[PDB]
Amino acid sequence: DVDSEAKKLLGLGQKHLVMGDIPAAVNAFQEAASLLGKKYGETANECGEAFFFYGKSLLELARNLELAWDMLDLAKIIFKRQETKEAQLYAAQAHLKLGEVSVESENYVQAVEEFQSCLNLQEQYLEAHDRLLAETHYQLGLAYGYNSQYDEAVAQFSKSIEVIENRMAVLNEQVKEAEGSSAEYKKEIEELKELLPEIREKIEDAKESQRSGNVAELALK
Amino acid sequence: DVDSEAKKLLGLGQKHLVMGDIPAAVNAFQEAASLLGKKYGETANECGEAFFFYGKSLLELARNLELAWDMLDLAKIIFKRQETKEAQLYAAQAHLKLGEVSVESENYVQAVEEFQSCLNLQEQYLEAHDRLLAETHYQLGLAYGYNSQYDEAVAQFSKSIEVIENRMAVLNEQVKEAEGSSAEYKKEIEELKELLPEIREKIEDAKESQRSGNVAELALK
Amino acid sequence: MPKDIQLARRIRGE
Amino acid sequence: MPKDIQLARRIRGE
Protein backbone atom coordinates (compact mmCIF):
# COMPACT_ATOMS: atom_id res chain seq x y z
CA ASP A 1 0.00 0.00 0.00
CA VAL A 2 1.69 3.18 -1.30
CA ASP A 3 -0.95 4.98 -3.37
CA SER A 4 -3.20 4.09 -0.45
CA GLU A 5 -1.18 5.95 2.19
CA ALA A 6 -0.10 8.82 -0.10
CA LYS A 7 -3.64 10.18 -0.60
CA LYS A 8 -4.19 10.05 3.16
CA LEU A 9 -1.13 12.28 3.66
CA LEU A 10 -2.47 14.69 1.04
CA GLY A 11 -5.69 14.96 3.06
CA LEU A 12 -3.74 15.30 6.32
CA GLY A 13 -1.60 18.11 4.97
CA GLN A 14 -4.41 19.89 3.14
CA LYS A 15 -6.33 20.21 6.40
CA HIS A 16 -3.21 21.06 8.37
CA LEU A 17 -3.09 23.93 5.87
CA VAL A 18 -6.75 24.97 6.19
CA MET A 19 -6.14 24.86 9.96
CA GLY A 20 -2.82 26.69 9.64
CA ASP A 21 -0.42 24.18 11.22
CA ILE A 22 1.96 24.54 8.29
CA PRO A 23 5.02 22.60 9.54
CA ALA A 24 2.57 19.71 9.98
CA ALA A 25 1.19 20.20 6.45
CA VAL A 26 4.71 20.38 4.98
CA ASN A 27 5.47 17.12 6.81
CA ALA A 28 2.41 15.41 5.34
CA PHE A 29 3.27 16.63 1.85
CA GLN A 30 7.00 15.84 2.04
CA GLU A 31 6.22 12.19 2.73
CA ALA A 32 3.42 11.84 0.18
CA ALA A 33 5.89 13.24 -2.35
CA SER A 34 8.47 10.72 -1.08
CA LEU A 35 6.08 7.73 -1.34
CA LEU A 36 5.22 8.59 -4.93
CA GLY A 37 8.78 9.47 -5.94
CA LYS A 38 10.01 6.07 -4.73
CA LYS A 39 7.23 4.20 -6.58
CA TYR A 40 6.85 6.14 -9.83
CA GLY A 41 9.88 8.38 -9.95
CA GLU A 42 10.22 12.08 -9.25
CA THR A 43 9.14 13.33 -12.69
CA ALA A 44 6.21 10.93 -13.07
CA ASN A 45 2.72 12.23 -13.69
CA GLU A 46 1.64 10.45 -10.49
CA CYS A 47 3.73 12.95 -8.49
CA GLY A 48 2.32 16.23 -9.83
CA GLU A 49 -0.35 17.00 -7.26
CA ALA A 50 1.84 15.78 -4.40
CA PHE A 51 4.71 18.05 -5.47
CA PHE A 52 2.46 21.07 -6.03
CA PHE A 53 0.84 20.79 -2.61
CA TYR A 54 4.31 20.29 -1.14
CA GLY A 55 5.67 23.46 -2.79
CA LYS A 56 2.49 25.37 -1.94
CA SER A 57 3.13 24.58 1.73
CA LEU A 58 6.84 25.37 1.34
CA LEU A 59 5.92 28.85 0.05
CA GLU A 60 3.68 29.37 3.07
CA LEU A 61 6.44 28.16 5.40
CA ALA A 62 8.79 30.89 4.14
CA ARG A 63 6.18 33.34 5.54
CA ASN A 64 13.51 27.32 1.65
CA LEU A 65 11.65 29.75 -0.57
CA GLU A 66 14.04 28.23 -3.09
CA LEU A 67 12.72 24.73 -2.37
CA ALA A 68 9.20 26.02 -3.01
CA TRP A 69 10.37 27.06 -6.47
CA ASP A 70 11.87 23.67 -7.37
CA MET A 71 8.77 21.79 -6.29
CA LEU A 72 6.28 24.11 -8.00
CA ASP A 73 8.25 24.21 -11.25
CA LEU A 74 8.52 20.40 -11.25
CA ALA A 75 4.75 20.36 -10.77
CA LYS A 76 4.25 22.78 -13.65
CA ILE A 77 6.22 20.48 -15.97
CA ILE A 78 4.40 17.34 -14.84
CA PHE A 79 1.11 19.20 -15.30
CA LYS A 80 1.72 20.88 -18.66
CA ARG A 81 2.96 17.67 -20.34
CA GLN A 82 -0.57 16.21 -20.01
CA GLU A 83 -3.38 17.54 -22.22
CA THR A 84 -6.26 17.36 -19.77
CA LYS A 85 -8.09 20.51 -18.80
CA GLU A 86 -7.80 19.45 -15.14
CA ALA A 87 -4.04 19.20 -15.62
CA GLN A 88 -3.78 22.46 -17.57
CA LEU A 89 -5.66 24.26 -14.79
CA TYR A 90 -3.28 22.70 -12.27
CA ALA A 91 -0.45 23.98 -14.44
CA ALA A 92 -2.03 27.41 -14.22
CA GLN A 93 -2.18 27.01 -10.43
CA ALA A 94 1.50 26.08 -10.35
CA HIS A 95 2.21 29.25 -12.32
CA LEU A 96 0.14 31.26 -9.80
CA LYS A 97 2.24 29.93 -6.91
CA LEU A 98 5.50 30.31 -8.86
CA GLY A 99 4.47 33.94 -9.27
CA GLU A 100 3.69 34.16 -5.55
CA VAL A 101 7.25 32.90 -4.89
CA SER A 102 8.62 35.58 -7.25
CA VAL A 103 6.89 38.31 -5.24
CA GLU A 104 8.35 36.97 -1.99
CA SER A 105 11.70 37.01 -3.87
CA GLU A 106 11.18 40.73 -4.81
CA ASN A 107 11.51 39.52 -8.41
CA TYR A 108 8.49 41.36 -9.82
CA VAL A 109 9.10 41.05 -13.57
CA GLN A 110 8.99 37.28 -13.27
CA ALA A 111 5.82 37.40 -11.16
CA VAL A 112 4.24 39.32 -14.06
CA GLU A 113 5.51 36.57 -16.38
CA GLU A 114 4.17 33.76 -14.18
CA PHE A 115 0.87 35.47 -13.33
CA GLN A 116 0.27 36.22 -17.02
CA SER A 117 1.09 32.54 -17.71
CA CYS A 118 -1.56 31.47 -15.22
CA LEU A 119 -4.10 33.86 -16.77
CA ASN A 120 -3.55 32.87 -20.41
CA LEU A 121 -4.10 29.27 -19.35
CA GLN A 122 -7.14 29.93 -17.15
CA GLU A 123 -8.94 32.08 -19.74
CA GLN A 124 -8.83 29.15 -22.21
CA TYR A 125 -10.84 26.90 -19.89
CA LEU A 126 -12.74 29.02 -17.31
CA GLU A 127 -15.94 31.08 -17.56
CA ALA A 128 -15.73 34.88 -17.40
CA HIS A 129 -17.14 34.85 -13.77
CA ASP A 130 -14.69 32.42 -12.11
CA ARG A 131 -13.24 33.89 -8.92
CA LEU A 132 -9.92 32.21 -9.92
CA LEU A 133 -9.73 34.78 -12.75
CA ALA A 134 -10.46 37.57 -10.27
CA GLU A 135 -7.56 36.16 -8.20
CA THR A 136 -5.08 36.13 -11.10
CA HIS A 137 -6.08 39.62 -12.25
CA TYR A 138 -5.60 40.85 -8.69
CA GLN A 139 -2.30 39.05 -8.16
CA LEU A 140 -1.18 40.41 -11.54
CA GLY A 141 -2.06 43.98 -10.57
CA LEU A 142 -0.12 43.46 -7.34
CA ALA A 143 2.97 42.42 -9.29
CA TYR A 144 2.57 45.31 -11.73
CA GLY A 145 2.11 47.75 -8.82
CA TYR A 146 5.08 46.38 -6.83
CA ASN A 147 7.11 46.71 -10.06
CA SER A 148 5.83 50.30 -10.12
CA GLN A 149 3.75 49.89 -13.34
CA TYR A 150 0.79 51.75 -11.93
CA ASP A 151 -1.36 52.05 -15.07
CA GLU A 152 -1.24 48.30 -15.78
CA ALA A 153 -1.79 47.62 -12.07
CA VAL A 154 -5.05 49.58 -12.10
CA ALA A 155 -6.05 47.80 -15.31
CA GLN A 156 -5.66 44.43 -13.64
CA PHE A 157 -7.46 45.51 -10.44
CA SER A 158 -10.39 46.74 -12.57
CA LYS A 159 -10.41 43.42 -14.45
CA SER A 160 -10.62 41.69 -11.07
CA ILE A 161 -13.60 43.83 -10.05
CA GLU A 162 -15.16 43.22 -13.48
CA VAL A 163 -14.95 39.47 -12.86
CA ILE A 164 -16.31 39.82 -9.33
CA GLU A 165 -19.16 42.00 -10.60
CA ASN A 166 -19.97 39.50 -13.36
CA ARG A 167 -20.26 36.75 -10.76
CA MET A 168 -22.72 38.82 -8.64
CA ALA A 169 -24.79 39.06 -11.85
CA VAL A 170 -24.76 35.29 -12.40
CA LEU A 171 -25.50 34.60 -8.73
CA ASN A 172 -28.53 36.92 -8.72
CA GLU A 173 -29.94 35.13 -11.76
CA GLN A 174 -29.45 31.77 -10.03
CA VAL A 175 -31.29 33.15 -6.98
CA LYS A 176 -34.28 34.11 -9.13
CA GLU A 177 -34.14 30.69 -10.85
CA ALA A 178 -33.84 28.79 -7.57
CA GLU A 179 -36.52 30.76 -5.75
CA GLY A 180 -38.66 30.54 -8.88
CA SER A 181 -38.20 26.79 -9.15
CA SER A 182 -39.02 26.55 -5.45
CA ALA A 183 -42.19 28.53 -6.19
CA GLU A 184 -43.34 26.06 -8.85
CA TYR A 185 -42.40 22.94 -6.89
CA LYS A 186 -44.51 24.24 -4.02
CA LYS A 187 -47.48 24.91 -6.34
CA GLU A 188 -47.44 21.40 -7.86
CA ILE A 189 -47.25 19.81 -4.40
CA GLU A 190 -50.56 21.46 -3.47
CA GLU A 191 -51.99 20.48 -6.87
CA LEU A 192 -51.10 16.86 -6.02
CA LYS A 193 -52.50 17.04 -2.47
CA GLU A 194 -55.87 17.93 -4.03
CA LEU A 195 -55.73 14.82 -6.25
CA LEU A 196 -55.49 12.29 -3.44
CA PRO A 197 -59.10 12.84 -2.21
CA GLU A 198 -60.54 12.29 -5.70
CA ILE A 199 -58.59 9.01 -6.13
CA ARG A 200 -59.55 7.86 -2.62
CA GLU A 201 -63.19 8.34 -3.66
CA LYS A 202 -62.62 5.99 -6.62
CA ILE A 203 -61.13 3.45 -4.20
CA GLU A 204 -64.07 3.64 -1.79
CA ASP A 205 -66.49 3.63 -4.75
CA ALA A 206 -64.96 0.27 -5.69
CA LYS A 207 -64.78 -1.23 -2.18
CA GLU A 208 -68.55 -0.69 -1.88
CA SER A 209 -69.31 -2.41 -5.18
CA GLN A 210 -67.35 -5.45 -3.95
CA ARG A 211 -69.03 -5.55 -0.54
CA SER A 212 -72.46 -5.30 -2.21
CA GLY A 213 -71.31 -7.53 -5.07
CA ASN A 214 -71.62 -11.29 -4.94
CA VAL A 215 -69.25 -13.78 -6.60
CA ALA A 216 -71.48 -14.41 -9.62
CA GLU A 217 -71.18 -10.84 -10.92
CA LEU A 218 -67.85 -11.26 -12.69
CA ALA A 219 -68.35 -14.80 -13.91
CA LEU A 220 -71.67 -13.76 -15.53
CA LYS A 221 -69.73 -11.11 -17.53
CA ASP B 1 -42.45 23.00 -48.53
CA VAL B 2 -44.29 20.00 -47.01
CA ASP B 3 -42.44 19.18 -43.79
CA SER B 4 -42.51 22.94 -43.32
CA GLU B 5 -46.30 23.29 -43.37
CA ALA B 6 -47.01 19.95 -41.62
CA LYS B 7 -45.39 20.98 -38.31
CA LYS B 8 -47.36 24.23 -38.38
CA LEU B 9 -50.61 22.23 -38.61
CA LEU B 10 -49.47 20.09 -35.68
CA GLY B 11 -49.04 23.26 -33.64
CA LEU B 12 -52.39 24.64 -34.87
CA GLY B 13 -54.25 21.50 -33.91
CA GLN B 14 -52.44 20.96 -30.61
CA LYS B 15 -53.56 24.39 -29.45
CA HIS B 16 -57.03 23.98 -30.91
CA LEU B 17 -57.05 21.00 -28.54
CA VAL B 18 -55.71 22.82 -25.47
CA MET B 19 -58.35 25.46 -26.26
CA GLY B 20 -61.02 22.82 -26.89
CA ASP B 21 -62.05 23.64 -30.48
CA ILE B 22 -61.77 19.98 -31.44
CA PRO B 23 -63.27 19.99 -34.96
CA ALA B 24 -60.62 22.63 -35.71
CA ALA B 25 -57.88 20.45 -34.17
CA VAL B 26 -59.07 17.38 -36.10
CA ASN B 27 -58.92 19.51 -39.26
CA ALA B 28 -55.34 20.59 -38.54
CA PHE B 29 -54.30 17.00 -37.84
CA GLN B 30 -56.13 15.44 -40.80
CA GLU B 31 -54.18 17.64 -43.20
CA ALA B 32 -50.80 17.27 -41.51
CA ALA B 33 -51.37 13.52 -41.75
CA SER B 34 -52.30 14.00 -45.43
CA LEU B 35 -49.19 16.09 -46.23
CA LEU B 36 -46.91 13.47 -44.72
CA GLY B 37 -48.78 10.49 -46.18
CA LYS B 38 -48.43 11.94 -49.69
CA LYS B 39 -44.70 12.63 -49.24
CA TYR B 40 -43.48 9.64 -47.21
CA GLY B 41 -46.32 7.17 -47.36
CA GLU B 42 -48.91 6.27 -44.77
CA THR B 43 -46.81 3.75 -42.83
CA ALA B 44 -43.62 5.83 -42.83
CA ASN B 45 -41.92 6.75 -39.58
CA GLU B 46 -42.36 10.41 -40.56
CA CYS B 47 -46.14 10.00 -40.09
CA GLY B 48 -46.23 8.58 -36.56
CA GLU B 49 -46.72 11.73 -34.51
CA ALA B 50 -49.12 13.20 -37.07
CA PHE B 51 -51.29 10.08 -37.01
CA PHE B 52 -51.26 9.80 -33.21
CA PHE B 53 -52.32 13.40 -32.72
CA TYR B 54 -54.97 12.88 -35.40
CA GLY B 55 -56.39 9.80 -33.65
CA LYS B 56 -56.11 11.48 -30.25
CA SER B 57 -58.36 14.27 -31.58
CA LEU B 58 -60.66 11.71 -33.25
CA LEU B 59 -61.17 10.01 -29.86
CA GLU B 60 -62.06 13.36 -28.32
CA LEU B 61 -64.45 14.13 -31.18
CA ALA B 62 -66.45 10.96 -30.43
CA ARG B 63 -67.13 12.59 -27.02
CA ASN B 64 -65.71 7.75 -35.94
CA LEU B 65 -64.54 6.19 -32.71
CA GLU B 66 -63.52 3.48 -35.16
CA LEU B 67 -61.36 5.95 -37.11
CA ALA B 68 -59.63 6.87 -33.85
CA TRP B 69 -58.69 3.21 -33.49
CA ASP B 70 -57.19 2.88 -36.98
CA MET B 71 -55.09 6.00 -36.59
CA LEU B 72 -53.82 5.20 -33.08
CA ASP B 73 -52.97 1.60 -33.96
CA LEU B 74 -51.11 2.76 -37.08
CA ALA B 75 -49.23 5.16 -34.80
CA LYS B 76 -48.42 2.35 -32.36
CA ILE B 77 -46.88 0.30 -35.18
CA ILE B 78 -44.88 3.22 -36.57
CA PHE B 79 -43.70 3.97 -33.03
CA LYS B 80 -42.84 0.46 -31.82
CA ARG B 81 -40.79 -0.40 -34.95
CA GLN B 82 -38.20 2.23 -33.90
CA GLU B 83 -35.92 1.55 -30.92
CA THR B 84 -35.71 5.05 -29.47
CA LYS B 85 -36.94 5.69 -25.97
CA GLU B 86 -38.83 8.73 -27.28
CA ALA B 87 -40.55 6.45 -29.79
CA GLN B 88 -41.21 3.69 -27.25
CA LEU B 89 -42.82 6.22 -24.92
CA TYR B 90 -44.93 7.45 -27.83
CA ALA B 91 -45.88 3.82 -28.43
CA ALA B 92 -46.93 3.66 -24.79
CA GLN B 93 -49.00 6.81 -25.34
CA ALA B 94 -50.67 5.24 -28.37
CA HIS B 95 -51.52 2.25 -26.18
CA LEU B 96 -52.98 4.61 -23.55
CA LYS B 97 -55.28 6.20 -26.14
CA LEU B 98 -56.13 2.82 -27.71
CA GLY B 99 -57.21 1.81 -24.22
CA GLU B 100 -59.20 5.03 -23.88
CA VAL B 101 -60.99 4.09 -27.14
CA SER B 102 -61.72 0.62 -25.72
CA VAL B 103 -63.44 2.16 -22.69
CA GLU B 104 -65.59 4.36 -24.92
CA SER B 105 -66.35 1.12 -26.82
CA GLU B 106 -67.44 -0.61 -23.54
CA ASN B 107 -64.73 -3.17 -24.37
CA TYR B 108 -63.10 -3.29 -20.94
CA VAL B 109 -60.94 -6.41 -21.23
CA GLN B 110 -59.06 -4.83 -24.11
CA ALA B 111 -58.64 -1.56 -22.22
CA VAL B 112 -56.93 -3.62 -19.50
CA GLU B 113 -54.75 -5.15 -22.22
CA GLU B 114 -53.87 -1.77 -23.75
CA PHE B 115 -53.42 0.04 -20.43
CA GLN B 116 -51.16 -2.75 -19.16
CA SER B 117 -49.25 -2.45 -22.47
CA CYS B 118 -48.73 1.25 -21.85
CA LEU B 119 -47.57 0.57 -18.28
CA ASN B 120 -45.08 -2.21 -19.08
CA LEU B 121 -43.52 0.14 -21.61
CA GLN B 122 -43.51 3.23 -19.39
CA GLU B 123 -42.00 1.44 -16.37
CA GLN B 124 -38.97 0.47 -18.51
CA TYR B 125 -38.07 4.11 -19.20
CA LEU B 126 -39.72 6.39 -16.58
CA GLU B 127 -38.83 7.19 -12.96
CA ALA B 128 -41.07 5.90 -10.16
CA HIS B 129 -42.51 9.47 -9.61
CA ASP B 130 -43.66 10.29 -13.17
CA ARG B 131 -47.27 11.49 -13.20
CA LEU B 132 -47.65 9.53 -16.50
CA LEU B 133 -47.35 6.36 -14.38
CA ALA B 134 -49.97 7.72 -11.98
CA GLU B 135 -52.18 8.26 -15.06
CA THR B 136 -51.76 4.71 -16.39
CA HIS B 137 -52.33 3.15 -12.96
CA TYR B 138 -55.48 5.24 -12.60
CA GLN B 139 -56.74 4.52 -16.12
CA LEU B 140 -55.99 0.84 -15.48
CA GLY B 141 -57.98 0.83 -12.24
CA LEU B 142 -60.84 2.48 -14.13
CA ALA B 143 -60.83 -0.31 -16.70
CA TYR B 144 -60.61 -2.98 -14.00
CA GLY B 145 -63.47 -1.32 -12.07
CA TYR B 146 -65.68 -0.88 -15.16
CA ASN B 147 -65.00 -4.57 -15.90
CA SER B 148 -66.13 -5.18 -12.31
CA GLN B 149 -62.72 -6.43 -11.05
CA TYR B 150 -62.88 -4.40 -7.88
CA ASP B 151 -59.85 -5.79 -6.03
CA GLU B 152 -57.49 -5.12 -8.96
CA ALA B 153 -59.13 -1.72 -9.45
CA VAL B 154 -58.29 -0.69 -5.90
CA ALA B 155 -54.76 -2.04 -6.37
CA GLN B 156 -54.24 0.20 -9.37
CA PHE B 157 -55.79 3.27 -7.69
CA SER B 158 -53.43 2.75 -4.72
CA LYS B 159 -50.48 2.44 -7.12
CA SER B 160 -51.56 5.77 -8.61
CA ILE B 161 -51.63 7.40 -5.17
CA GLU B 162 -48.27 5.77 -4.38
CA VAL B 163 -46.78 7.43 -7.47
CA ILE B 164 -48.40 10.78 -6.65
CA GLU B 165 -47.13 10.55 -3.07
CA ASN B 166 -43.61 9.70 -4.27
CA ARG B 167 -43.62 12.81 -6.44
CA MET B 168 -44.63 15.05 -3.48
CA ALA B 169 -41.57 13.58 -1.72
CA VAL B 170 -39.25 14.42 -4.62
CA LEU B 171 -40.75 17.90 -5.00
CA ASN B 172 -40.25 18.72 -1.31
CA GLU B 173 -36.59 17.72 -1.56
CA GLN B 174 -36.18 19.96 -4.61
CA VAL B 175 -37.77 22.82 -2.66
CA LYS B 176 -35.22 22.42 0.14
CA GLU B 177 -32.41 22.17 -2.45
CA ALA B 178 -33.62 25.22 -4.39
CA GLU B 179 -34.28 27.37 -1.34
CA GLY B 180 -30.97 26.16 0.10
CA SER B 181 -29.08 26.98 -3.08
CA SER B 182 -30.80 30.37 -3.06
CA ALA B 183 -29.57 30.80 0.52
CA GLU B 184 -25.94 30.20 -0.45
CA TYR B 185 -26.05 32.29 -3.63
CA LYS B 186 -27.33 35.19 -1.54
CA LYS B 187 -24.53 34.73 1.03
CA GLU B 188 -21.74 34.73 -1.58
CA ILE B 189 -23.17 37.86 -3.23
CA GLU B 190 -22.73 39.77 0.03
CA GLU B 191 -19.27 38.23 0.46
CA LEU B 192 -18.39 39.66 -2.98
CA LYS B 193 -19.91 43.09 -2.26
CA GLU B 194 -17.48 43.36 0.67
CA LEU B 195 -14.52 42.63 -1.63
CA LEU B 196 -15.07 45.55 -3.99
CA PRO B 197 -14.07 48.23 -1.42
CA GLU B 198 -10.77 46.48 -0.64
CA ILE B 199 -9.88 46.24 -4.36
CA ARG B 200 -10.91 49.86 -4.96
CA GLU B 201 -8.43 50.82 -2.22
CA LYS B 202 -5.66 49.03 -4.14
CA ILE B 203 -6.68 50.98 -7.25
CA GLU B 204 -6.61 54.34 -5.47
CA ASP B 205 -3.36 53.33 -3.71
CA ALA B 206 -1.87 52.95 -7.20
CA LYS B 207 -3.38 56.08 -8.77
CA GLU B 208 -1.69 58.14 -6.02
CA SER B 209 1.73 56.57 -6.59
CA GLN B 210 1.45 57.52 -10.28
CA ARG B 211 0.32 61.10 -9.60
CA SER B 212 3.20 61.53 -7.12
CA GLY B 213 5.51 59.47 -9.33
CA ASN B 214 7.60 61.02 -12.05
CA VAL B 215 8.60 59.33 -15.33
CA ALA B 216 12.10 58.39 -14.17
CA GLU B 217 10.85 55.99 -11.47
CA LEU B 218 10.27 53.00 -13.73
CA ALA B 219 13.20 53.53 -16.06
CA LEU B 220 15.57 53.68 -13.04
CA LYS B 221 14.30 50.19 -12.03
CA MET C 1 -70.13 9.14 -15.76
CA PRO C 2 -67.36 11.09 -17.62
CA LYS C 3 -65.87 12.94 -14.61
CA ASP C 4 -63.60 9.87 -14.51
CA ILE C 5 -61.68 10.98 -17.62
CA GLN C 6 -61.30 14.55 -16.30
CA LEU C 7 -59.61 13.29 -13.13
CA ALA C 8 -57.19 11.42 -15.40
CA ARG C 9 -56.27 14.58 -17.30
CA ARG C 10 -55.70 16.09 -13.82
CA ILE C 11 -53.44 13.28 -12.58
CA ARG C 12 -51.26 13.91 -15.62
CA GLY C 13 -50.56 17.61 -15.85
CA GLU C 14 -52.48 18.16 -19.13
CA MET D 1 2.68 44.84 3.77
CA PRO D 2 1.22 41.26 3.71
CA LYS D 3 -2.49 42.17 3.96
CA ASP D 4 -2.22 42.09 0.15
CA ILE D 5 -1.97 38.29 0.08
CA GLN D 6 -4.90 37.88 2.49
CA LEU D 7 -7.18 39.88 0.19
CA ALA D 8 -6.15 37.48 -2.58
CA ARG D 9 -7.17 34.43 -0.55
CA ARG D 10 -10.47 36.31 -0.03
CA ILE D 11 -11.05 37.04 -3.73
CA ARG D 12 -10.73 33.31 -4.35
CA GLY D 13 -12.95 31.49 -1.89
CA GLU D 14 -10.09 29.78 0.02
PDB file of N, CA and C in Angstrom, chain A residues 191-192 194-195 198-199 202, chain C residues 3-4 7 10-13:
ATOM      1  N   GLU A 191     -51.153  21.042  -5.817  1.00  0.00           N
ATOM      2  CA  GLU A 191     -51.991  20.479  -6.869  1.00  0.00           C
ATOM      3  C   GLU A 191     -52.135  18.971  -6.685  1.00  0.00           C
ATOM      4  N   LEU A 192     -51.077  18.310  -6.193  1.00  0.00           N
ATOM      5  CA  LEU A 192     -51.098  16.860  -6.017  1.00  0.00           C
ATOM      6  C   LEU A 192     -51.827  16.466  -4.739  1.00  0.00           C
ATOM      7  N   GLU A 194     -54.460  17.865  -3.678  1.00  0.00           N
ATOM      8  CA  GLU A 194     -55.871  17.932  -4.030  1.00  0.00           C
ATOM      9  C   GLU A 194     -56.302  16.816  -4.974  1.00  0.00           C
ATOM     10  N   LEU A 195     -55.373  15.987  -5.450  1.00  0.00           N
ATOM     11  CA  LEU A 195     -55.735  14.824  -6.251  1.00  0.00           C
ATOM     12  C   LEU A 195     -56.039  13.607  -5.405  1.00  0.00           C
ATOM     13  N   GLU A 198     -59.727  12.769  -4.582  1.00  0.00           N
ATOM     14  CA  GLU A 198     -60.538  12.294  -5.695  1.00  0.00           C
ATOM     15  C   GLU A 198     -60.226  10.827  -6.021  1.00  0.00           C
ATOM     16  N   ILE A 199     -58.950  10.421  -5.927  1.00  0.00           N
ATOM     17  CA  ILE A 199     -58.595   9.015  -6.127  1.00  0.00           C
ATOM     18  C   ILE A 199     -59.118   8.144  -4.986  1.00  0.00           C
ATOM     19  N   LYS A 202     -62.542   7.113  -5.679  1.00  0.00           N
ATOM     20  CA  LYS A 202     -62.624   5.992  -6.615  1.00  0.00           C
ATOM     21  C   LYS A 202     -62.321   4.671  -5.923  1.00  0.00           C
TER      22      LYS A 202
ATOM     23  N   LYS C   3     -66.822  12.292 -15.514  1.00  0.00           N
ATOM     24  CA  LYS C   3     -65.871  12.942 -14.612  1.00  0.00           C
ATOM     25  C   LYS C   3     -64.634  12.074 -14.393  1.00  0.00           C
ATOM     26  N   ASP C   4     -64.741  10.768 -14.665  1.00  0.00           N
ATOM     27  CA  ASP C   4     -63.602   9.872 -14.514  1.00  0.00           C
ATOM     28  C   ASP C   4     -62.456  10.253 -15.448  1.00  0.00           C
ATOM     29  N   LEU C   7     -60.576  13.612 -14.174  1.00  0.00           N
ATOM     30  CA  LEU C   7     -59.611  13.293 -13.128  1.00  0.00           C
ATOM     31  C   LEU C   7     -58.321  12.709 -13.700  1.00  0.00           C
ATOM     32  N   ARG C  10     -56.194  15.374 -14.988  1.00  0.00           N
ATOM     33  CA  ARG C  10     -55.698  16.094 -13.824  1.00  0.00           C
ATOM     34  C   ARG C  10     -54.534  15.373 -13.153  1.00  0.00           C
ATOM     35  N   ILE C  11     -54.564  14.035 -13.126  1.00  0.00           N
ATOM     36  CA  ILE C  11     -53.441  13.275 -12.581  1.00  0.00           C
ATOM     37  C   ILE C  11     -52.188  13.507 -13.416  1.00  0.00           C
ATOM     38  N   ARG C  12     -52.285  13.361 -14.738  1.00  0.00           N
ATOM     39  CA  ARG C  12     -51.256  13.909 -15.619  1.00  0.00           C
ATOM     40  C   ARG C  12     -51.481  15.411 -15.758  1.00  0.00           C
ATOM     41  N   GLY C  13     -50.396  16.170 -15.812  1.00  0.00           N
ATOM     42  CA  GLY C  13     -50.560  17.614 -15.852  1.00  0.00           C
ATOM     43  C   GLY C  13     -50.913  18.189 -17.211  1.00  0.00           C
TER      44      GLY C  13
END
